[model samples]
Target: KVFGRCELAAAMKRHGLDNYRGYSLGNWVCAAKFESNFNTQATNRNTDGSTDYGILQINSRWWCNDGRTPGSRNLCNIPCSALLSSDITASVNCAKKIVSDGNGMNAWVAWRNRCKGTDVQAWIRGCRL
Candidate 1:
């Protein structure tokens, strides 16, 4: 849970992104805009109480404890690789993955489509410059 606008900026700069449309931090702030209001440590739960963790709102038990990531050292507590949990790099890459994977509009397919109207605005507003 590392929810700060600066965090988003840091991730974006770290990942060499210019902006959200031509280079939308892989929907980092976009996902955060929806997931937890960019509240990094924000945690939620499923009906079964499995628990989704962090600002990226990742389910540690699910994603963290799984296979491999594009640029993460491990899984649990990995950097901005997970869109829901503050992995700006991963989130951006996830966007790329969506474009790359071309999976249409699934859950982890944020980069699959464009955010409309205010969504984009908020992404810019809350995102670090």
Candidate 2:
């Protein structure tokens, strides 16, 4: 089944994410409303010079290119596609590696205590591999 724009956006909401949305859930809601209108096709240059793509605005070059069809490696499957398509944990773990892993989330840890939640959105300590 092909995923539509709104379908994915709602998926991101139900799951509670901040990848493309913003720093927090409230900010994400606002950005989701104005920037792409919660459009899944959204894409933007990250502060790291990489790109954020798709409805959750995943970094296509990182995940998509890594695990595409055929030559696709496990690294290619994206949260919106293969990851979200099957294992929810897989997507969360992947996001952590790219974003939350290491000392990266220290900033989030400082302000967004909500990041310490156990649900999917949380970047809580040692949540991901």
Candidate 3:
């Protein structure tokens, strides 16, 4: 998992997620906490039989191939397994692009659910960003 708040901030900045399109780094960090608990290998099957992958919990419907998901867009052009790494480069890049498709962080339900209308700064408090 990512080691620290500052490290996550750094990675997000490197991947253009820190302040891209007005979404704050804290928003991303807060979403990550609820979506995957900072666990890169995180995966979950949706009630609709879709799956989510990686730290941002990208959905199979548009992001990656779970090998069995029908209508899987695999838009990031990377295998779903690539998202399950601690490296986070693949996941972050995929999320960056997905969010850029005009939804911003709204693409991730967790962001909208937990981070969007809350005290997001607590996600980065005390971390030297």
Candidate 4:
């Protein structure tokens, strides 16, 4: 599923991502914009052989178990395939765990590079939420 900006913003907000770990809704929205372009099935493989999955791009090396990451901890305790589903519940839950585990939104480099320290309000602009 590919979500529009506001649609994703609303969805993330619904899953309690707004101000999660002090990162605002716009911050999450901006990260999602850059990370996966709101596509639920987005995936990216890293040079280290780890793969990122889902909208927030949870990584296989430390988050989900892909049965191929070699040293995966699967800290999120979920199969990487779960993140690919359009339901997004599992993805949102895993993302919360990622932030709660002391990584903050910095777990995603996309957020650090594209959304961090910027006026991200535009990411959620024109949305009635």
Best by lDDT: 4
lDDT per residue (tens digit) for residues 1-129 in model 2: 233334434444456554532344433333333333444455566555555544334454556552323333345454434442422334434544544534443323212343233243322223221
In model 2, the runs with Cα more than 4 Å from the true position are 1-13, 16-23, 30-35, 43-52, 66-76, 79-97, 102-129
Q: Mind giving the per-residue lDDT tens digits that candidate 3 earns over 1-129?
A: 754666776787777787777888889888888888888888999988888888888888888887878767889988888889888899888887888898778888878877898988787778766
Error of 1 at 68 (Å): 20
Q: RMSD, model 4, all Cα superposed? A: 0.9
lDDT of each: 0.48, 0.41, 0.82, 0.91
lDDT of 1: 0.48
Query: In lDDT terms, how accurate is model 4?
Result: 0.91
The 10-residue segment of model 2 with minimum total lDDT is: 120-129
Give a tens-digit lDDT track for model 4, residues 55-123.
Answer: 989999999999999967999899999999988889999998898887788888999988889999999
Runs of candidate 1 with Cα error greater than 4 angstroms are: 16-23, 66-105, 108-122, 125-129
* Prediction RMSDs, each to the true structure: 6.7, 10.4, 1.5, 0.9
Residue by residue across 13-108, what tens digits does model 1's lDDT show?
576654533445535566555666666556565565445544445543434533332232333344333544445455444444333433322343
Instruction: Give model 1's TM-score versus the native structure.
Output: 0.48
Give the CA lDDT, 0 to 100, for residue 32 in model 2.
Answer: 33
Query: Best candidate per TM-score, number?
Result: 4
